[PDB]
């Protein structure tokens, strides 16, 4: 089986999630064919040079999975788009582009974080385009770590404030964008996160039955999608 997770938002002061993730790696990822992490692995990323001890332990635990023969892949989220090649090497992860099609046991599946489908949120998409500019990223990364942490803290705070004022519609995926992505790639299956609204949605793409499977955020329990020859299963599991 091939596993998909997203939206862990790992951080020091959410220790149940950290413990749950370590257990997941040892008990589930170890026996899988591959693991895909579809963004927001960390609560925030302000550069691979961050000395946070959590990053060291998480990198080693992920690298132990891929060193055991189970490849680990990462699509960036909105929290952790700065995660780079240095941390990918430390963690034994392969970095993927923002959209990727997999063929799994004969089944073509599109994967992404999900935030690029939220096309009605013009304010977010504006922000996203700016912070994805390599020149601006490279400029941010030149600041002292403590300044980067203050910026991130402010961004987190203003994000929470902005979100409480936004309609549910602009913060969920746009259906035209969903269908457009699934027809661009001619898939009947899409797995994403970002919205923190776990569900299996039925829809039409390519004039055929299609499915959009949304991972849950990790808080008091975890969420994965398990893909086998015969099934695509959204599974919630306790810590
Ligand atoms: C150049 C390199 C910069 C590097 C920075 C590295 C640190 C990144 C830290 C993570 C920030 C991230 O949380 C912001 C974000 O993505 N918010 C969108 C997201 O909501 P979340 O709160 O993240 O769940 O998902 C929501 C649903 O899709 C969406 O609505 C939120 O988007 C917003 O709230 C964006 C607002 O519309 C505008 C953003 C205002 C940010 C304030 C900037 C303060 C910076 C000051 C520095 C001078
Ligand atoms: Mn998230
Ligand atoms: Mn997200």
Numbering used by the authors: 2 to 240
Task: Quote from the publication.
The LpxH enzyme cleaves the pyrophosphate bond of UDP-2, 3-bis(3-hydroxytetradecanoyl)-glucosamine (UDP-DAGn) to yield lipid X (PubChem CID 123907) and UMP in the fourth step of lipid A biosynthesis. Roughly 70% of Gram-negative bacteria, including the WHO critical priority Gram-negative pathogens for R&D of new antibiotics, utilize this enzyme. The importance of LPS, and lipid A in particular, for the viability and virulence of Gram-negative bacteria makes the inhibition of lipid A biosynthesis a promising target for the development of antibiotics. To enable a structure-based drug design approach for the optimization of JEDI-1444, we produced LpxH proteins from E. coli (EcLpxH) and K. pneumoniae (KpLpxH) and solved the X-ray crystal structures of various enzyme-product and inhibitor complexes during the optimization of the chemical series.
As for HiLpxH, the EcLpxH and KpLpxH proteins copurified with a bound molecule of lipid X in the substrate binding site but we were able to develop protocols to displace the product and form enzyme–inhibitor complexes. The 1.35-Å resolution EcLpxH complex, in particular, provides a detailed view of this portion of the substrate-binding site. In contrast to the highly mutated EcLpxH structure previously published, the lid of our structure is generally well-ordered. One of the lipid X aliphatic tails extends toward the protein surface and is partially solvent-exposed, while the other is completely buried in the enzyme interior. The nonpolar side chains that interact with this buried aliphatic chain are conserved in EcLpxH and KpLpxH, producing a roughly 120° bend in the aliphatic chain. Indeed, the binding of the lipid X product to EcLpxH and PaLpxH structures shows differences at the ring 1-binding site that would be expected to affect inhibitor binding.
